[PDB]
Design a binder for this molecule. Structure first.
Ligand SMILES: Nc1ncnc2c1ncn2[C@@H]1O[C@H](COP(=O)(O)OP(=O)(O)O)[C@@H](O)[C@H]1O
Ligand SMILES: Nc1ncnc2c1ncn2[C@@H]1O[C@H](COP(=O)(O)OP(=O)(O)O)[C@@H](O)[C@H]1O
Ligand SMILES: Nc1ncnc2c1ncn2[C@@H]1O[C@H](COP(=O)(O)OP(=O)(O)O)[C@@H](O)[C@H]1O
Ligand SMILES: Nc1ncnc2c1ncn2[C@@H]1O[C@H](COP(=O)(O)OP(=O)(O)O)[C@@H](O)[C@H]1O
Ligand SMILES: Nc1ncnc2c1ncn2[C@@H]1O[C@H](COP(=O)(O)OP(=O)(O)O)[C@@H](O)[C@H]1O
Ligand SMILES: Nc1ncnc2c1ncn2[C@@H]1O[C@H](COP(=O)(O)OP(=O)(O)O)[C@@H](O)[C@H]1O
Ligand SMILES: Nc1ncnc2c1ncn2[C@@H]1O[C@H](COP(=O)(O)OP(=O)(O)O)[C@@H](O)[C@H]1O
Lengths: 247, 248, 243, 248, 248, 248, 247
C-alpha cells in the first residue's frame, strides 16, 4: 500500500505500468529517500515476471572484493579463502529481476562485466572458463549523477547509455508537497498500529509544518520523524507539539 | 534511594525515554562529554521491554580501528594469521539485548557500512562469505561530536545517520541544566559521605552558588569528581566556598 | 547499404578465408564486435568456438593470468592450474575487445603468440601450442599510444596487417534510417507494439542527430520510442524529448 | 632502611598520603624524573586498607604501545596476532590490591579510553573476550609529563584525567625541597656504607654544601646515585667536595 | 627454413655468427624492433656446440615485475610468494642449454645483478632461498635500446653490460640493408603465396622500387606483414605499385 | 695481555675500576671511539666478584633494531613475525656474569624502557612470554655519544641514563693523554714486530714526536692499526719520521 | 702469467708481496674491472695461507636480507625455515681469506658486525648464543667511493678506517697504457689457444689503436674485445679493421 498522489509521481506510476511488460534495464535516480527501491520494487510486482525472484542487493554495504564475486560468482582458483564454485546472484535470480543500489559504486571492472551481461545475457564467472548465460532484468538505481561520473572517468559511458534506455528521475519530497501529507498519513497509520497507540492523525497546525519542512532525508526522514512522533504522541492527535521537537 | 533528573529539559528527556519504552528502533544520543549520554542509554534499556536482557556497551574508541571490524561482529576462521575459532561477536553477545556503541563518529567507513547492513537486515557474516547467524539487537549510538557536520566531511555515512536517527536525544551540557547541578550535588556528596565515611551533610549557600556558576566543561563528569574530592577533605558537616574554591 | 560498409562487407568476405590477426578500429558502437563476430561466421572456422572477452572486465594484473593461464602458485593467489582464455579458444577464434587496455606485458606476450603460436602458461615450464584467430578491436588511437609509449610499436604493426576502420554513424548517413527500422521492427515485434515505421518528420532529426553513441545509442533510443510509442508511427515528439 | 620526609612540602604530603590511604579513588602522581614518584605511591599502599593486598606496578613504556591494552587487560584464545593463552591482564592480577601505572602519558587513546571505563564501571572485557570481567583495583597513576598539556595536543583523553585528577599530588623536584638534600644524603650514606662495608660517617661541610648547590636534575635518583658513587670512591670516614666534585 | 642473410653486413654478421659458433661466451644483440634479433640469436644457437640442447627464450617484457625474478630464478618453499614447494625456473630450464633474454633493458636492477652472477659463477639464489643453484647456461640476450645511455642513466648496471658483451652483434635496421629488402620480400611472398594458395609469383620493378625506397620502421617484421597483406589482396600473378601503394 | 695506563686520568680510572670491582651497580662507561671503552669494561670484569663468571659482550648495532629486544631479553614461542621455538635471551646467557651493551646510543626507546626494569627489578619478561624470568647481571653500558644530549632530543629515556649513571666513567681522547701514546706505540710495535717477525724494535726520537702531535681521532685503536701498517712496511730496526709520515 | 709490467702496477705488486705475510684487512678500490679481484686473489696466493680456502663472494648478487645470515651463519629458529643451524661463510673461510667484493653494499648492521670480526675475530651466529671465533683474512674491495658514502650516512665510519689501513688503489687501464699492449698479447695468446687459432699478435696499426682506447671497461673489456678479435681472426695477426669493429 504505497503512496502516489503528487504530480510527477502519478505520472511515474504510469511510466511504471507501461514499462513493467518490458525486458530492458531500467535506471532509477534521485536523492536517498525518495522511493528508488520502492519504485524498483514495484517495477517488479507489475512486471510480467512479478512472480519471479527479486534479488535486491546494496552496493555500498559490500566489500568491493566480495561484491564482484558475490554478484557473478567464482570458481575454485580465484579465491584463497574459499574453494568450491558458488553461483553468483545472477544465476540465483535466473529469470528474475536484479536491482543494484547506488550503481555509481561499481568497479570500472564490474561495470564492464555488467554491460556485456545486459546485452548478451552472457558472462564468465570470476576465474571462470564456461560462458554463463542468464535471464536477468536489471534495475539500476543511484543517488549519484552518472553523467558527472562519466566525465570524471569513474563510470563507463557505454554502460550508462545501455541503462539510459528507461530512466526514471525521482524528485525529492521537498518537490511533491502533494505527497508529504498522504505519506505521513500512511506512516502515522503503520506505527499507530505497530505500537498500539490511539493516534488518529495530524492537526492542521501540524500538517502545515510537515509541508514546510525541507525533508532532506525525504520519504525516509518522514518515516522516522513520524514513527518518533507516534511514540511521543500522548493523545489522539499530533501538532506543532511533538513535531517541532524535530522538524 | 533514587537517580537524578529535575531540570525541565531533562525532566523531559526522561519521559521521552519512558515513551520510547515500547520501542526498538535505534536511538542516537548526543551531548558533550560527561553530560549523561551513556547514563541515558542505560536508562533507555532499563526501561525498554528488554531490561532484563543484557546490555552490551562497547566504547568504539577502546579498540584499535583495525580490530573493531573483528570484534563487533565476529570472525570467520583462518582469514587473519592465527584463529583459535571463528570469533563470536559483541553483536552476538548483545543478541536479544541492547548494543550501546559509544562514540559513533569513531567508526571506520567500512564498519559504518557493515553496521547499517545489520540495522536493516539484522543478519551478518564474520568476514568473507555469508550470514549464518540470527541477531536481535537494539542499536544505541551515542557520540559527543556533531554527526551532521561529519557527513559533509565524508567521515560519516549519511544513510547510516538517518537509520540510527530514528529516535534522537540530545543531552544539554550541565551549564544549561543548572537546576540539576545542586540536586546532583547532594546526591554525590551523600554518596561518598557514605562510602568514604565523612559526617558531611550538605553544601553551604556559599558553595552552592559557586557550583551553580561554574561552567563544568566536563559537565557532571566533573561535578562528580570535584565533589568526591571536596568530601574527602571534610572535617565539618558542611562544605563551603572554602573546600571548592581552592579546587574549582 | 552504405558508402563504406557495403565495401567493408567485402574485405570481410575477401578475408575470412584467412588466418592472420585482424585489427578493427572505430568509435564506441560502430559495430567493431558485430564485424568480428561476423568475420568469424565467414571464416574457415566459423564452425569452431568464438571466445569473446572484454579486456577491461578483468583487472589489469589478473589478465595475462586469465588470458594466458598460470600453474600452481606461480604467483600470489593461485590454488590450482588454469587455462588461458587463449587455450579455451584453441582452434576457434579469440576476440580481444579494447586492445587498448593490455598491459605492456600482455602486449609483449600477445605478440609472441601471434607470431609463433607457442607461449608459456604464466609460471609454466613447458611451452604450450595453439592455433587461434585473433580479432582485436579498440576504439582508441593506437598510433598515439605507441608514441606515448603506452602501447608496443611492433604489436600494433603485426595486428595492423588487416586493419578495418569502421567510421561512425555520423559518416554513414545511409545506415541511420535502414537501421532505425531494423530496430523498430524487432523492438515492435518484441514489445507487442503496432508500430510500422518512422515519419519523414522524425527520419529528419534522426539522420541529423550526431549519434556519438553510434549504432548502440540508436538501438537504444529506438527501443525507447517503440515503448513510448502509441500509434503505428513515431515523430519529432517521442524522438525529441528524451533524445 | 626508612624514608626521608623532612622538608616542608613532603612532610605535608606525607600527611595527605595518610588521609587518603583509607580511601579507594585513583590518585595521580606528577613530578620530574626523580622526585621519587613511585615511592610516594608504594607508601600510599602501605597505609591503605589493602596494604597487605598486592601492589602491581608496571612501566607503561616498557611494553610496546600495541600489546599494551592486551597486556593491561589481557586476552584469550585468538586476537590480531600471537595471542595463544589467557592472560587475565595485569588488572585482575591486582583485583582488590593496587595497580601502579608508571608514566601514564604513554598510554594509547584506546587504552586511555578502555581504562577510563574500568575506573568507573570496574568492569571490562578481555580484548577478544566475551565475558564482562569485574575487579576491585586501586589504580595509582604517575607521569613525569604535563597531562593538561597533552590534553591540548589531543595526545591524552580529557575525561580520563578528570577521572584521575581526583587526587592529584604534585611532588616538586629536589632542587626545591633542599631541606631533604642533606637528610637524604645521610640516609643514602648510612646505607651504601653498610652495603659496601665502609667507615663513612658523614660529609664535610665543604661537601654538605655542594649537595645543596646542585639542581639535581635527577632529584633523589641522582642523589642516591651520586652518594653511592661517593661511598665507593670514599677513603676516609668523611666525604667532602673532593669525592663529590668529580660528579656533582 | 631459409635465412635471408644476403646483404653486405648481414652476410658478414653470419660469418661472425659462425666464427662465434665454437664458443660459449655470452652474446649481446642490439637493433631496432624487428631487424630480427631473436633470429640471429636462434641461429647463434643452431650453430653452437649446444644446438641439440634446449634454447629457452623468454621476453623480459612479457613477464610482470611482480614475478620475473621468481619466474627466472625460481623460488624456494616459503618463498616471498605465499605458496608451497619450490618451483624451478627458466634458468634451470635452460640448464646446459642456451637462454635468450629478449629486450634485456627491462631487467630490474636486483635482477641484472643476480644475472651478473650466473654469467660469472653460474650460481644464483632461488627467490627467497639459501641453497646456491648452479646452471651451465649459454646466455644470448638482446634489446632495442642503446645500453650505454642506460648505464649512464644509471638504469642498467655497468659491469653487467661489460659481462654479456663478450661478443656483441649490431643488427642494423632495414633502411640500411636495401639488398635484403627485395630478396626478403620475395621469400615472404613465395611463403604466403603458397600458404594462402594464390597464383602470385613476384613483384614488379614498379613496386620493387617502392619497396627498396620505403624506410621500414617496423623493420623486417612489417615487411613480412605488408607483403602477407599484398599476397592477400593479390589478384593477378604479379604485385605492383597498385597494391603496395594502397598501404605503404 | 699487557695493560697500559701511565697517564694521570687513565691511572686514575684504573683505580676507579678497582674501587668499583666490588660492586654490582651499573657502570656507564662514557667516551670517544677507541678510547679503550671496551678494555675498561673487560677490566672492570677481570677484577669483579665475578671475574670467573661470563663476560657477555654484545654490539647493540650489529643486531637490527627490531630483533634487538628479541635476542636480548629473549622470546617465548612463535610470538613475533618469524618465531619457531622457545629461545633464550642474552641476559640469561650471562646470568651471574656481565652483559656489556656496546653503545646504548642505539636503543629503541622500547628496549631502553624495557632495559630499565631489568636494571632495578632484576626480572624481565620474554617477548611474548607469561613467566617473569629473573637474573642477576652486571650491566656495563658503554656509549660514545653524549647521552645527556640524546636525553634532551628525547632520543634516550631520562630515567635510563640515571639507572646506568651510578658510576659513569668518561674516557679522555688520546689527544688528552700524550703520556700513553708513546708507551702504546711501543706496546704495539712489539706485538706486531713479533707477530710479523720483523727486526724492528722501536721508533726514532723524530718519530715519537709525531706520534704525539697527531691527534689520533681514532684513538688507541686508531694508533694500533697505524703502527701495524708501520711495523709491516718497516725496514730497519727503527720506524722513523718517514714510515709514519706518508700515512699520517 | 698474470700481468704486472707497468709503473703503478709493478709498484703495487711490491706492496702485495710485502703485505701477504700479514693477516690484516685490506681494502681495494678501482673502477669496475681494473683487477681488484685479481689482486685480491694474488694477495692470497702469496699469503702464508695460500694453501687455504679463498672465499670470494659477490655481495650484490645476494638478497640483502639473507646476507648477514649467509655471512655469519644462523642457529635454528633464527627465522621461519631455520630447521637446523647453518654456518656462515666466515666459518667457511676460517683459516683463510674471505673476500667481500663491492663492500659498499653491506647493511649498517652488517658493517658493524663485520667490524668486530676484524678486531676480535668473533661474531654471533644469527640468533646464536655462543661466540663463534674464526681466523679470517677479510679482503674488502669496492667501486664506489666509501668516503663519499660515509658522509651520506650510508656507510659506517670506524669500519671505513679500520679497513683503510692497507687500502689499495688500482688505477683504470686508461692510465696503465704500459699494461695494455702486454695484457692484450697475454689475452690473444690465451683464447688463440683455447679456440685453436693461428693468431700470433697485433700489427702496429692495431696496437696504436689499443693504447688509444680509454677502455672504460678497463682490463675487463680488453679481455672480451680480444676474445672477440681472436675469434673473428682470419690470418695470423689482427689490425685496425678487426678491432675497429669493436674499438
Ligand atoms: N513512495 C513511497 N510511499 C510510501 N513509502 C515510501 C515511499 N518511498 C519510500 N517509502 C519508505 O521510505 C523508505 C525509503 O526507501 P527507499 O526506497 O529505499 O529509498 P531510496 O529512494 O533511497 O531507495 C522505505 O523503507 C519505504 O518504506
Ligand atoms: N542525570 C544524572 N543523574 C545522576 N548521575 C548522572 C547523571 N548524568 C550523569 N551522571 C553520572 O555522571 C557520570 C558520567 O556518565 P556518562 O553518562 O557515562 O558520561 P557520558 O555522557 O560522556 O557517556 C556517571 O558515572 C553517572 O553516575
Ligand atoms: N551493421 C549493423 N547492422 C545491424 N546492427 C548493427 C550493425 N552494427 C552495429 N549494430 C548494432 O549496434 C550494436 C554495436 O555492437 P558492437 O558489436 O558491440 O560494436 P562496438 O564494439 O563498436 O561497440 C550491436 O548490439 C548491434 O545490434
Ligand atoms: N623521600 C625519599 N626518601 C628516601 N628515598 C627516596 C625518597 N624519594 C625518592 N627516593 C628514592 O629515589 C629514587 C627515585 O625513586 P622513584 O620513586 O622511582 O622516583 P620517580 O618515580 O619520581 O622517578 C628511588 O631509589 C627511591 O627509593
Ligand atoms: N634475415 C631474415 N630472414 C628471414 N626472415 C627474417 C629475417 N630477419 C627477420 N625475419 C623475420 O622477421 C620477423 C622479425 O623477427 P625478430 O627476429 O623477432 O625481430 P627482432 O628480434 O629484431 O625484434 C620474424 O617473424 C622473422 O621470422
Ligand atoms: N689501555 C690500553 N692499553 C693497551 N691497549 C688498549 C688500551 N685501551 C685500548 N686499547 C686497544 O685499543 C683498541 C680500542 O679498543 P676499544 O676498547 O674497543 O675501544 P672503544 O671501546 O672505545 O671503541 C683495541 O685494540 C684495544 O686492545
Ligand atoms: N693484472 C692482471 N693480469 C692478468 N689478468 C688480469 C689482470 N687484471 C685483470 N685481469 C683480467 O681481467 C678480468 C677483470 O678482473 P677483475 O679483477 O675481477 O676486475 P674488477 O676490478 O672488476 O674486480 C679478470 O677476469 C682477469 O682475468
Amino acid at each position: 500500500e504505497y503512496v502516489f498522489e503528487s504530480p510527477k509521481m502519478k505520472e511515474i506510476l504510469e511510466k511504471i505500468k507501461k514499462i513493467s511488460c518490458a525486458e530492458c534495464p531500467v535506471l532509477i535516480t534521485g536523492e536517498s529517500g525518495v522511493g528508488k527501491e520502492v519504485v524498483a520494487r514495484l517495477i517488479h510486482k507489475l512486471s510480467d515476471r512479478s512472480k519471479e525472484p527479486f534479488v535486491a542487493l546494496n552496493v555500498a554495504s559490500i566489500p568491493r572484493d566480495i561484491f564482484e564475486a558475490e554478484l557473478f560468482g567464482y570458481e575454485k582458483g580465484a579465491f584463497t579463502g574459499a574453494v568450491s564454485s558458488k553461483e553468483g546472484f545472477f544465476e540465483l535470480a535466473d529469470g528474475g529481476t536484479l536491482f543494484l543500489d547506488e550503481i555509481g559504486e561499481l568497479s570500472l571492472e564490474a561495470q564492464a562485466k555488467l554491460l556485456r551481461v545486459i546485452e548478451s545475457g552472457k558472462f564468465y564467472r570470476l576465474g571462470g572458463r564456461k560462458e554463463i548465460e542468464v535471464n536477468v532484468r536489471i534495475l539500476a538505481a543511484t543517488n549519484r549523477n552518472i553523467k558527472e561520473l562519466v566525465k570524471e572517468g569513474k563510470f563507463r559511458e557505454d554502460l550508462y547509455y545501455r541503462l539510459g534506455v528507461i530512466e526514471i528521475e525521482i524528485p525529492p519530497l521537498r518537490e511533491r508537497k502533494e505527497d508529504i501529507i498522504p505519506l505521513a498519513n500512511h506512516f502515522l497509520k503503520k506505527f499507530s498500529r505497530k505500537y498500539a497507540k490511539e493516534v488518529e492523525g495530524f492537526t492542521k497546525s501540524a500538517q502545515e509544518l510537515l509541508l514546510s519542512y525541507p525533508w532532506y532525508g525525504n520519504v525516509r526522514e518522514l518515516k522516522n520523524v513520524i514513527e518518533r512522533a507516534v511514540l511521543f504522541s500522548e493523545g489522539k492527535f499530533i501538532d506543532r507539539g511533538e513535531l517541532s521537537c524535530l522538524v
